[PDB]
Structure formats: C-alpha cells, structure tokens
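= Tokenised fold =
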Amino acid sequence: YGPHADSPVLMVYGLDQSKMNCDRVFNVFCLYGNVEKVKFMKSKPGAAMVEMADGYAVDRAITHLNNNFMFGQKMNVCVSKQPAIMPGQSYGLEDGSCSYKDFSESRNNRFSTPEQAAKNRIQHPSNVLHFFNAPLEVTEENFFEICDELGVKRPTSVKVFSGKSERSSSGLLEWDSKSDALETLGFLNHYQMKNPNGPYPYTLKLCFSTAQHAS
C-alpha cells in the first residue's frame, strides 16, 4: 500500500526505436526513481516496459513524462498490467545491445536510500538541464564537442557554476524547447567525460532544472 500505481512496472509507448535502447531509457527514467529493468516489447514496436523500485516511482514518471514529446512522437506512460519484468524472449537491437537490461546494481541509480532519494527534486520536464559531476575545468566548448560526437543538439547556452572545495563542476544547460532537452537527456546522461587527473571518467549526471535560463 501507498503509491497509486499497483505495479512497479510501467509501460512506455511512443519511443523512437531508431534512437532508443535500454541505456537511453534508463537515462530518462532514472530521474524519477530507481530503475531495476528495461525491456523492449516484441509485440509492440516503439514500446518498452520499465520496472522501477516501487509504485511511487511509477506515479512520478507518469505524472511528469506522460504525453511528452520525443523525436516528434508523443510518449504515453502508464502502469503496466504486469507486476515484474521477466527476462524471457530477449532479442538484439540494431545497435547490438540487448532488448532487456537489468540496472538493479547500477551505481547511477539515484534513489538507493531514502536520503539519496530525497536529493532528487521534483522533476518536471523543462528546457534547462542541471548538470553535476563534470570535470573541474569543463568548458562550454567541451559540451559542444560531446554533443557533436553524440549527434545531439548543442545547448544554446551553458552556465558553469562557481565551486570551491568541490572535486567536480555543476551548472546548467539550456535548449530552445522541452523536447530538445528531453531528447538530449536520453543521449547525454551518464556520458563518460575525460578525466585528465585520474583513471576514471567523470560520469556526467543530468536532471531537470527549474531555472528559466542557463544564465
């Protein structure tokens, strides 16, 4: 009892399967809860199930993402009739990745304890993304370079926040439209940014901002 959704599994239609894979779905839905599994459906092109940690995550994802547009398609986000995603009958996507993926052990999940969960603000989709965990000396040009690599739209404005006694940078990335930002989110979240000072790339973390501008 508690959440409205009677399953931790949502169904999402309206995905662009020429662009989306399980990682890119996780890149969107991880803003709303822990993502345990994603499975693209054999029966239904452009649709995927997404198992969250619980129903409250489903309620948030539906509330914020239903009827949003991505790649000109209208997304439909609703509770699944299924209580869990089972692995059976998986297939390879065109990019060679599996139609099913388990993300339950991902270090990129953001709701793994209540106190971690609490640090996620309400995530109403907007045209500005907040970025965290970028390299200390990141520049707008760095982001342009990565967006070009990924084949996504460059942000129209980038703001890096001031920081001290901080081992990574954060800031704001703005696009002209909400769909521009959402489209980018799915491609750019968790991008592995170069670390000149240590072995591990910086995992770029994005979420939605309430800021009107990256100014």
User: Anything to note?
Assistant: The CA atoms of residues 16 and 46 lie 6 Å apart. The longest helix spans residues 55-65. Helices lie at 22-29, 55-65, 114-117, 140-150, 178-188. The longest strand covers residues 128-134.
